[PDB]
Enzyme design. Sequence first.
Site, PDB file in Angstrom:
ATOM      1  N   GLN D  10      50.207  27.824  29.530  1.00 51.66           N
ATOM      2  CA  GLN D  10      48.919  27.260  29.876  1.00 51.66           C
ATOM      3  C   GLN D  10      48.304  27.899  31.048  1.00 51.66           C
ATOM      4  O   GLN D  10      47.108  28.174  31.060  1.00 51.66           O
ATOM      5  CB  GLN D  10      48.788  25.823  30.439  1.00 51.66           C
ATOM      6  N   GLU D  60      52.625  26.125  22.023  1.00 53.46           N
ATOM      7  CA  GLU D  60      52.086  24.854  21.651  1.00 53.46           C
ATOM      8  C   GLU D  60      50.665  25.059  21.291  1.00 53.46           C
ATOM      9  O   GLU D  60      49.891  25.577  22.093  1.00 53.46           O
ATOM     10  CB  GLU D  60      52.157  23.855  22.791  1.00 53.46           C
ATOM     11  N   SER D 129      53.251  31.637  35.042  1.00 60.60           N
ATOM     12  CA  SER D 129      53.714  30.820  36.153  1.00 60.60           C
ATOM     13  C   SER D 129      55.182  30.821  36.304  1.00 60.60           C
ATOM     14  O   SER D 129      55.930  30.667  35.340  1.00 60.60           O
ATOM     15  CB  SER D 129      53.245  29.397  35.999  1.00 60.60           C
ATOM     16  N   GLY D 132      57.281  27.754  34.481  1.00 60.11           N
ATOM     17  CA  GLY D 132      57.358  27.097  33.229  1.00 60.11           C
ATOM     18  C   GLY D 132      58.220  27.768  32.191  1.00 60.11           C
ATOM     19  O   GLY D 132      58.731  28.885  32.363  1.00 60.11           O
ATOM     20  N   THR D 168      56.054  19.638  39.153  1.00 62.58           N
ATOM     21  CA  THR D 168      56.155  18.809  37.984  1.00 62.58           C
ATOM     22  C   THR D 168      57.320  19.154  37.114  1.00 62.58           C
ATOM     23  O   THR D 168      57.604  18.479  36.125  1.00 62.58           O
ATOM     24  CB  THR D 168      54.894  18.962  37.143  1.00 62.58           C
ATOM     25  N   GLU D 172      62.393  23.739  37.741  1.00 61.25           N
ATOM     26  CA  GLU D 172      61.688  24.924  38.111  1.00 61.25           C
ATOM     27  C   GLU D 172      62.519  25.879  38.919  1.00 61.25           C
ATOM     28  O   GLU D 172      62.429  27.070  38.626  1.00 61.25           O
ATOM     29  CB  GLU D 172      60.436  24.561  38.836  1.00 61.25           C
ATOM     30  N   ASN D 195      49.106  26.988  44.602  1.00 55.48           N
ATOM     31  CA  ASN D 195      48.042  26.020  44.417  1.00 55.48           C
ATOM     32  C   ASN D 195      47.898  25.069  45.613  1.00 55.48           C
ATOM     33  O   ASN D 195      46.781  24.620  45.889  1.00 55.48           O
ATOM     34  CB  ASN D 195      48.302  25.242  43.139  1.00 55.48           C
ATOM     35  N   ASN D 217      41.234  27.904  39.346  1.00 49.05           N
ATOM     36  CA  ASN D 217      41.281  29.135  38.611  1.00 49.05           C
ATOM     37  C   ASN D 217      40.030  29.970  38.757  1.00 49.05           C
ATOM     38  O   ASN D 217      40.050  31.161  38.431  1.00 49.05           O
ATOM     39  CB  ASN D 217      41.629  28.813  37.218  1.00 49.05           C
ATOM     40  N   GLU D 243      46.768  53.503  40.560  1.00 43.56           N
ATOM     41  CA  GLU D 243      46.642  53.783  41.963  1.00 43.56           C
ATOM     42  C   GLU D 243      47.056  52.561  42.726  1.00 43.56           C
ATOM     43  O   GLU D 243      47.724  52.684  43.753  1.00 43.56           O
ATOM     44  CB  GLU D 243      45.225  54.212  42.255  1.00 43.56           C
TER      45      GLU D 243
HETATM   46  N1  LIG Z   1      46.572  27.650  39.285  1.00 43.18           N
HETATM   47  C1  LIG Z   1      46.981  26.993  38.238  1.00 43.18           C
HETATM   48  N2  LIG Z   1      48.235  26.547  38.165  1.00 43.18           N
HETATM   49  C2  LIG Z   1      48.502  25.878  36.996  1.00 43.18           C
HETATM   50  C3  LIG Z   1      47.624  25.624  35.937  1.00 43.18           C
HETATM   51  N3  LIG Z   1      48.245  24.917  34.937  1.00 43.18           N
HETATM   52  C4  LIG Z   1      49.461  24.737  35.375  1.00 43.18           C
HETATM   53  N4  LIG Z   1      49.689  25.297  36.608  1.00 43.18           N
HETATM   54  C5  LIG Z   1      50.946  25.271  37.376  1.00 43.18           C
HETATM   55  O1  LIG Z   1      51.956  25.937  36.598  1.00 43.18           O
HETATM   56  C6  LIG Z   1      53.107  25.067  36.447  1.00 43.18           C
HETATM   57  C7  LIG Z   1      53.050  24.341  35.141  1.00 43.18           C
HETATM   58  O2  LIG Z   1      53.629  25.005  34.032  1.00 43.18           O
HETATM   59  P1  LIG Z   1      53.530  24.133  32.641  1.00 43.18           P
HETATM   60  O3  LIG Z   1      52.124  23.853  32.291  1.00 43.18           O
HETATM   61  O4  LIG Z   1      54.402  22.937  32.827  1.00 43.18           O
HETATM   62  O5  LIG Z   1      54.202  25.036  31.613  1.00 43.18           O
HETATM   63  P2  LIG Z   1      53.865  26.363  30.934  1.00 43.18           P
HETATM   64  O6  LIG Z   1      54.327  27.402  31.945  1.00 43.18           O
HETATM   65  O7  LIG Z   1      52.492  26.427  30.450  1.00 43.18           O
HETATM   66  O8  LIG Z   1      54.928  26.473  29.679  1.00 43.18           O
HETATM   67  P3  LIG Z   1      55.799  25.224  29.022  1.00 43.18           P
HETATM   68  O9  LIG Z   1      56.777  24.634  30.031  1.00 43.18           O
HETATM   69  O10 LIG Z   1      56.692  25.652  27.850  1.00 43.18           O
HETATM   70  O11 LIG Z   1      54.730  24.234  28.606  1.00 43.18           O
HETATM   71  C8  LIG Z   1      53.006  24.051  37.562  1.00 43.18           C
HETATM   72  O12 LIG Z   1      53.617  24.559  38.727  1.00 43.18           O
HETATM   73  C9  LIG Z   1      51.502  23.877  37.694  1.00 43.18           C
HETATM   74  O13 LIG Z   1      51.188  23.454  39.024  1.00 43.18           O
HETATM   75  C10 LIG Z   1      46.314  26.091  36.036  1.00 43.18           C
HETATM   76  O14 LIG Z   1      45.428  25.964  35.195  1.00 43.18           O
HETATM   77  N5  LIG Z   1      46.057  26.790  37.238  1.00 43.18           N
HETATM   78  N1  LIG Z   2      35.211  62.987  53.526  1.00 41.09           N
HETATM   79  C1  LIG Z   2      35.742  62.371  52.492  1.00 41.09           C
HETATM   80  N2  LIG Z   2      36.899  61.891  52.295  1.00 41.09           N
HETATM   81  C2  LIG Z   2      37.179  61.311  51.113  1.00 41.09           C
HETATM   82  C3  LIG Z   2      36.284  61.099  49.984  1.00 41.09           C
HETATM   83  N3  LIG Z   2      37.025  60.464  49.085  1.00 41.09           N
HETATM   84  C4  LIG Z   2      38.366  60.136  49.360  1.00 41.09           C
HETATM   85  N4  LIG Z   2      38.330  60.751  50.729  1.00 41.09           N
HETATM   86  C5  LIG Z   2      39.537  60.725  51.555  1.00 41.09           C
HETATM   87  O1  LIG Z   2      40.681  61.159  50.698  1.00 41.09           O
HETATM   88  C6  LIG Z   2      41.926  60.381  50.912  1.00 41.09           C
HETATM   89  C7  LIG Z   2      42.321  59.786  49.649  1.00 41.09           C
HETATM   90  O2  LIG Z   2      42.678  60.739  48.603  1.00 41.09           O
HETATM   91  P1  LIG Z   2      41.934  60.755  47.238  1.00 41.09           P
HETATM   92  O3  LIG Z   2      40.764  61.672  47.345  1.00 41.09           O
HETATM   93  O4  LIG Z   2      41.643  59.388  46.639  1.00 41.09           O
HETATM   94  O5  LIG Z   2      43.089  61.459  46.256  1.00 41.09           O
HETATM   95  P2  LIG Z   2      43.042  61.793  44.716  1.00 41.09           P
HETATM   96  O6  LIG Z   2      41.783  61.350  44.299  1.00 41.09           O
HETATM   97  O7  LIG Z   2      44.290  61.007  44.010  1.00 41.09           O
HETATM   98  O8  LIG Z   2      43.288  63.244  44.608  1.00 41.09           O
HETATM   99  C8  LIG Z   2      41.465  59.365  52.020  1.00 41.09           C
HETATM  100  O9  LIG Z   2      41.968  59.907  53.296  1.00 41.09           O
HETATM  101  C9  LIG Z   2      39.920  59.342  52.081  1.00 41.09           C
HETATM  102  O10 LIG Z   2      39.270  59.110  53.341  1.00 41.09           O
HETATM  103  C10 LIG Z   2      35.014  61.640  50.284  1.00 41.09           C
HETATM  104  O11 LIG Z   2      34.088  61.541  49.315  1.00 41.09           O
HETATM  105  N5  LIG Z   2      34.697  62.261  51.440  1.00 41.09           N
HETATM  106 MG   LIG Z   3      52.378  24.470  27.964  1.00 38.74          MG
END
Ligand SMILES: Nc1nc2c(ncn2[C@@H]2O[C@H](COP(=O)(O)OP(=O)(O)OP(=O)(O)O)[C@@H](O)[C@H]2O)c(=O)[nH]1
Ligand SMILES: Nc1nc2c(ncn2[C@@H]2O[C@H](COP(=O)(O)OP(=O)(O)O)[C@@H](O)[C@H]2O)c(=O)[nH]1
Ligand SMILES: [Mg+2]
Lengths: 426, 426, 428, 428
Positions: D10, D60, D129, D132, D168, D172, D195, D217, D243
């Site tokens: 869920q 489910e 999560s 669960g 709950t 866990e 949460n 969420n 990256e």
């Molecule tokens: N942030 C967030 N946490 C959620 C949400 N729904 C459930 N949780 C959290 O996730 C856990 C609940 O898991 P369940 O819903 O019991 O179970 P499940 O992981 O979906 O799977 P089953 O146990 O088989 O039903 C608890 O710790 C809840 O607090 C949600 O919509 N948002």
């Molecule tokens: N002057 C300058 N530096 C840049 C630019 N883009 C990324 N950098 C620098 O380059 C480094 C990051 O490497 P990156 O260019 O992303 O590597 P790659 O793309 O995987 O080859 C950092 O130190 C940045 O400040 C740019 O357009 N101008």
């Molecule tokens: Mg469930």
Amino acid sequence: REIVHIQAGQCGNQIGAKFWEVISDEHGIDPTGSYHGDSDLQLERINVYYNEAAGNKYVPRAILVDLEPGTMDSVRSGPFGQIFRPDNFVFGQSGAGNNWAKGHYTEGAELVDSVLDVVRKESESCDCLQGFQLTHSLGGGTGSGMGTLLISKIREEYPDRIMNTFSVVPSPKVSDTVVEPYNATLSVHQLVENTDETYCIDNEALYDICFRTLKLTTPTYGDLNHLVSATMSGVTTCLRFPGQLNADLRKLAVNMVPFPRLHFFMPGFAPLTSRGSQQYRALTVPELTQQMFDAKNMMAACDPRHGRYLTVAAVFRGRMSMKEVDEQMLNVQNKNSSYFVEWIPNNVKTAVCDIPPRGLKMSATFIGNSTAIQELFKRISEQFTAMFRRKAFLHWYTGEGMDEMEFTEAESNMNDLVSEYQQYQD
Amino acid sequence: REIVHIQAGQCGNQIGAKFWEVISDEHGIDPTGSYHGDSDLQLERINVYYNEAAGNKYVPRAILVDLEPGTMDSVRSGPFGQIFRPDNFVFGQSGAGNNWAKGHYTEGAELVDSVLDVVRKESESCDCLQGFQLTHSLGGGTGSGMGTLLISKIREEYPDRIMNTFSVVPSPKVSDTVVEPYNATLSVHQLVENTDETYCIDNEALYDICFRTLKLTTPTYGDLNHLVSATMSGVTTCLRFPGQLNADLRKLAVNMVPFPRLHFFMPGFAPLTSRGSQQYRALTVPELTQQMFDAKNMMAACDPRHGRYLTVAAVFRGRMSMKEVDEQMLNVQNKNSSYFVEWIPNNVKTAVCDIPPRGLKMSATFIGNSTAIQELFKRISEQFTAMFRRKAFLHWYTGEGMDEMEFTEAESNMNDLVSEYQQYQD
Amino acid sequence: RECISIHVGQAGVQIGNACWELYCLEHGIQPDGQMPSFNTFFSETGAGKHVPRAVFVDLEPTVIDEVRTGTYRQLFHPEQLITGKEDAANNYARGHYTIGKEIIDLVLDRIRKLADQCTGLQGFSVFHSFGGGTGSGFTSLLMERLSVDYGKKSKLEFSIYPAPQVSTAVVEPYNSILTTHTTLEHSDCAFMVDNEAIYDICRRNLDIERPTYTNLNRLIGQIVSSITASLRFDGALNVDLTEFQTNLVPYPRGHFPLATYAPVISAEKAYHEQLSVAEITNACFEPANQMVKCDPRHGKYMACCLLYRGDVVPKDVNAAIATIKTKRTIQFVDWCPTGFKVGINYEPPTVVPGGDLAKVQRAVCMLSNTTAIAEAWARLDHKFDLMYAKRAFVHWYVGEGMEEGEFSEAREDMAALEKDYEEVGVDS
Amino acid sequence: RECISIHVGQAGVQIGNACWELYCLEHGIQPDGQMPSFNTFFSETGAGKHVPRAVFVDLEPTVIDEVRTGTYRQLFHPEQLITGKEDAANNYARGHYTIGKEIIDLVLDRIRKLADQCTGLQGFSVFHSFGGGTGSGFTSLLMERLSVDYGKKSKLEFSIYPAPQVSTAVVEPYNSILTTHTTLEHSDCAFMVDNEAIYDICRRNLDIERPTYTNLNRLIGQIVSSITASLRFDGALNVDLTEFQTNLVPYPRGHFPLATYAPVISAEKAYHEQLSVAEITNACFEPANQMVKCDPRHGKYMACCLLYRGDVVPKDVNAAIATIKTKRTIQFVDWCPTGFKVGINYEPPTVVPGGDLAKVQRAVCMLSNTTAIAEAWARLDHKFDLMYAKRAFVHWYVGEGMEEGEFSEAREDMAALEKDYEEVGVDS
Ligand SMILES: Nc1nc2c(ncn2[C@@H]2O[C@H](COP(=O)(O)OP(=O)(O)OP(=O)(O)O)[C@@H](O)[C@H]2O)c(=O)[nH]1
Ligand SMILES: Nc1nc2c(ncn2[C@@H]2O[C@H](COP(=O)(O)OP(=O)(O)O)[C@@H](O)[C@H]2O)c(=O)[nH]1
Ligand SMILES: [Mg+2]
Ligand SMILES: Nc1nc2c(ncn2[C@@H]2O[C@H](COP(=O)(O)OP(=O)(O)OP(=O)(O)O)[C@@H](O)[C@H]2O)c(=O)[nH]1
Ligand SMILES: Nc1nc2c(ncn2[C@@H]2O[C@H](COP(=O)(O)OP(=O)(O)O)[C@@H](O)[C@H]2O)c(=O)[nH]1
Ligand SMILES: [Mg+2]
């Protein structure tokens, strides 16, 4: 031949905002950056403060530094914030909070390395530097704290360049930071021996001038920093533009410093009077000299007739006779002989530029080095001592690692400058 | 005179997607295949990368290889995927998954025979090959794994042709495959002695540049691979087009390799800055050299001033004076003499092409071979060892038959390259 | 440039309600967050909605629910609204320990989340009350953690100062004494106001003889906005929060700057009267506008900060300062020169629609650290002592694990604090 | 390039219901199969109907009948719908052996038929999560056959991890122990989720206090789609399933990467909040979003894979990685460098109409293999032991042909597995 300027702290940044504005005014450079002038001279010596960028764009050779973006942003948001390049805005994040230790010793220290790197880039952009100039506050965290740190490193890199700075000196009445004298004390400790010269600007005095002679009832810092920039721009333009006398900043420094340690200056400015009276003013050399000598037209809260004058520089802008200038300066020397120091014959020196400031027929910049300056140091030192004993806010500073013995030495050093002024006060 | 290019791995295929795009841009070739340019030069040396098929169709001389049709399809689906002939798409089905063993040793090996056959068909289509180029990732399955295999066979068939490759080197921070160092280790073991030269590209460094100087906040790999292609295309166009200096790839290889085994390169690129500042920039040779030298403008996560420079190539595109270039390179050598190796007098070499990249006035490609490269090898080798001891994912590899002693030798060989860099680091 | 507000307890939250309402008023922020237009406090969404970077804590659902059902419920992110179920019962023993200590971890993680949202964390500030269970209990608990994680960030506290005459909490002395012990040592700065003093302000300057907390907190909000909105907005002298700390805290103990605010004027009182910067600051040194019932003339000043809104020219400020330095009877401690922080924002003062205060064109907030605060502690000393000597209500703490020695200790820590004020008073 | 989905039990099927519903949502597939538009998963008919290449197994009738009477009954081919009549009764002994073993041949032949329909089989994956009867019993039975026939294809399993507290299913443990024994050895990789942990996610991130499995969420489906739909769609980094295996499985034992998923956000929570790639990945390393109740901080990491949807820029990813590597407390096993697979799809994240999750523009899935899994086995060890020592319920397995030695053996295999985790934990 070129100069680099660095601004720091909220103060320094806002002053520079006006300074650069003026420089571009002088050369016809638009708030957006291009040159749209109309005089040959306007481009001719532009190199000292601007780099021409492609497209006929001029870049101000300066660095804007702070630890809070918002201040920088506000600067940038106005005209002439667009002329600065983004690369000249160097800043951190979190303040300093007006804390020397943070600025200099710890956190701000961290930023300085990036600042300096840009400095180096500009030093290379220049063909040949004449020097550097910095704008900042003496009691501020980044203004003085971080700024000082920077200066020590720049000087190290360029021993052969002029290192000067203009700085806002804590006014007797308006301190913002409780430990503003502490920051100032520490900056003396560091700056004096790591600079060629420093200028003393008092906001209180400036507020008096703006109402006293200019009769204004609305100024802001931008209006007072205009006056500051008038003196700063006054100095360097002559160096830039054709004149009669001797138009080199280093030579100015040479003529104004009789002793390795006593290089503090009292700026003043003429003409500087309200429009009402402008219909009743005459424009002569004696007229400018009257305004220049008068202590109330000083931008420093000092009194030159209280102390003794070591050196005086009189810079003139616009067409004047040599004779008249010579004679009036002589007369000044003669009539105020009781304030001048007897060791220096003919203690009043001149410099003459033939280019007037935009909108005026003539103008003059007063630069003095008196003993009266020591009074500011005395006020700070005293206030410092009291705080020192209590450690006010020193947990913030010692929390950031600033040691009390370093502060102790700083105190001595302040007292040393005073004693040396006494040694030459006689 | 001609070159064949082979792309492999998702990386290699996507890089090539941009590379070829650019080459056709350079020559005015339409995404559908015909020539619609407008310059004599555009057709004149087209032979190096294109076959003109009947109807004035140009076929890119390259093979697209992968083990997943979908990537190939995505390439084919875009513009310029139509210019490639179907016969150049050689691919299998089921990935590699980023597995060397699959790629090289086993599955991918199977495809290689069909790839090579097409290679042979193209080698006959050329009049005279200069060489081959491959694009790939070092830690990838087809990229390195299968790609390496191919290289060993091509070299075997053509000992006298240039064999180089550009490859993505695992960045310290972003590895995708857990054994990415393993794949890389194996590729060193195979590639180094089966190639004339290899280039080291780090995506991390690339991502820093795109935001650091280019101030961009959206790049993708296509934007970063654009930068990659700028360097690749920079190299070969000069060879293709009229210049001043010495425009031959083999000669480049000769000048950059002092020792049979140490042929790893650090690419860099200038000018490379945001539009805002473009209004504040100046275009000079020193400007390009400032950007070229600066480690932050390198595309490899290395630091050349940490290591020593063995060789430097400065390739220039556009009209520049010879003098200026010579002098600035000399200055570089002079000022950065502490990083250069003393065994090679005048270690900075130049190449000059008079054709600027489309849209720019000038440009420069920095290619260096420092000792600093060894640091990448060290990182990989170390990571490798740990994995080696645990056999992480080696069941995938040993499951495909890869033997641990081969890996052991690969480890040694990595260590050998490091020791040889030390041997010439001095 | 970012910061975090923390609202703990009813007092903290209900004041916060006014505060965030005001920030909305500052920029035209809609209840849903839509702002058509201050990112130091706010975080932006793609819809152009901005989220106030703040945390609301209540251990009783009700007050937060009040937020949740009001207009600003759309403004606040649900995660910012944190609530427990039960109370501290006026009692540190549960607030800091037994109850609040359970939820605090959540609270901290929301804070940390916001700290990660911050890019430049400047710091933060905590709103509460010195007497309550969460108001002071939980509050100190928080500081204990925040001072670790954010050790270098601004730790400014704002608290309601227990009214000497009216208090609804019989063990408030005990609560406040325990907080002293734990906050002094962890916090950077704690500010406080007295609702009784405020009532006097409402009846004399606003002419209102019916203040509720919803009025009282509007006034508090004004003060707070001056230092929070307007310090991030533009001005001549833009002062930060870290700057505030760096300009207001002189010693590593705490310190406790008290609030004063002038203008506090009814609409009719604004008519026929022209305030200048100087005149407003004159009002700031008058006992009459002192937000805590403690006589400014009794003690000596240690710190003082003046923060300006709207039409303020430094020129005038300078003159004003000159006169407050020289004209007034303000005695100050030797240690200090008169470096009073001047913050000058161009940002105008704002008024709550339907509020009591008149539209003003300029405004000044004053923070001050005076030696008279020791008398406030003296008040607590005896109140605590009386209860503790009889051991009245002691079982309500003991049953939660409190120790009697601990309570003695906490008193002693307060005594030490008073002694340090004594020390500062001695000039040197 | 093809693959097969397998839904057993869920949990497997109801999750699948969500999965295929999502794939229909991915392309606009009508219940009758008509698609107007992913052939890696689907097989095309001349009518343009596509058949999902998958197998549905329930012993489910009921759950499959549920499919058969629902809308997707037209989609699925009658041969894909396989049902028995009786259940496993929660019992491996019947699921794997006595009952399920009878139908499995049919099941396999339908699989093989589909394998013949594949042209390039890349591989497959199984949904079930662990506790669960069919969720784990039958499942392993299937693996026993699939690993022979498709030895070189991807064998990825997905399973609900038994909740430690609610179950709950009294046997866990016994179911899960038997699956270990048989799945470890056959499968390539098994993934699982709890949460109970999910309920916590639903109530905290989705704000739902009434989750049913039909909600639960959907969330699972999201995760799955990221690795199934989007890995076949276009991206930057197109990662393949092979990256995945090549980047997630480090040893020849199994391994069990656990799922983590971020974003999981209610619509209202999405409002007022801006996620980035980095922020989402921050969430991915938080225990709070861990889909299995097992503490990430307890164990050490072995593998980690991050997969990206929608608006993801590698640039941001790189930064995010840097911080997770260095900022976090993530301890990792020596063996591994941090080569975490990054998959980057342009394919945007999708949302179920009428679902709980907010529309997002980008999303990140994380797979991780941590040593803490041994504790999960420890849980099973004792539960099994208790029952087995008493021999409770043993007759329900013995009567189907189970051996007691076998059960001991399976436990021992689990013990060996735990020991190998121990081994990995020892760094070397
Ligand atoms: N942030 C967030 N946490 C959620 C949400 N729904 C459930 N949780 C959290 O996730 C856990 C609940 O898991 P369940 O819903 O019991 O179970 P499940 O992981 O979906 O799977 P089953 O146990 O088989 O039903 C608890 O710790 C809840 O607090 C949600 O919509 N948002
Ligand atoms: N002057 C300058 N530096 C840049 C630019 N883009 C990324 N950098 C620098 O380059 C480094 C990051 O490497 P990156 O260019 O992303 O590597 P790659 O793309 O995987 O080859 C950092 O130190 C940045 O400040 C740019 O357009 N101008
Ligand atoms: Mg469930
Ligand atoms: N300014 C102001 N003060 C308030 C306000 N509400 C309560 N107070 C004061 O703060 C104290 C009341 O604290 P409680 O409300 O009893 O308690 P609490 O601090 O919220 O925490 P608990 O005792 O656990 O309920 C008293 O001193 C009240 O006068 C308000 O809205 N504004
Ligand atoms: N003339 C002048 N002084 C300024 C300005 N801004 C701040 N100041 C002075 O600088 C001192 C404060 O330091 P500040 O600049 O805030 O320090 P910082 O910002 O932490 O470096 C005070 O004495 C102010 O009067 C300005 O724009 N012009
Ligand atoms: Mg309450």
